[PDB]
Design a protein around this ligand. Structure first.
Ligand SMILES: [Zn+2]
Lengths: 21, 30
């Protein structure tokens, strides 16, 4: 879920704001 | 095998800072 898109291409603060509870 | 592991250590520190109050869920896979 986590690792593939965001370790191959850079995730942004608004995009990781979605992987919050 | 290592860059995936090293990057998850930075990914979980940015998650922690952006979610803040709501906490978060970290799972590697899926
Ligand atoms: Zn590092």
């Amino acid at each position: 879920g986590i690792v593939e898109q965001c370790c191959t291409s850079i995730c942004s603060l608004y995009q990781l704001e979605n992987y919050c509870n | 095998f290592v860059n995936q592991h090293l990057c998850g250590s930075h990914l979980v520190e940015a998650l922690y800072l952006v979610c803040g109050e709501r906490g978060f869920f970290y799972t590697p896979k899926a």
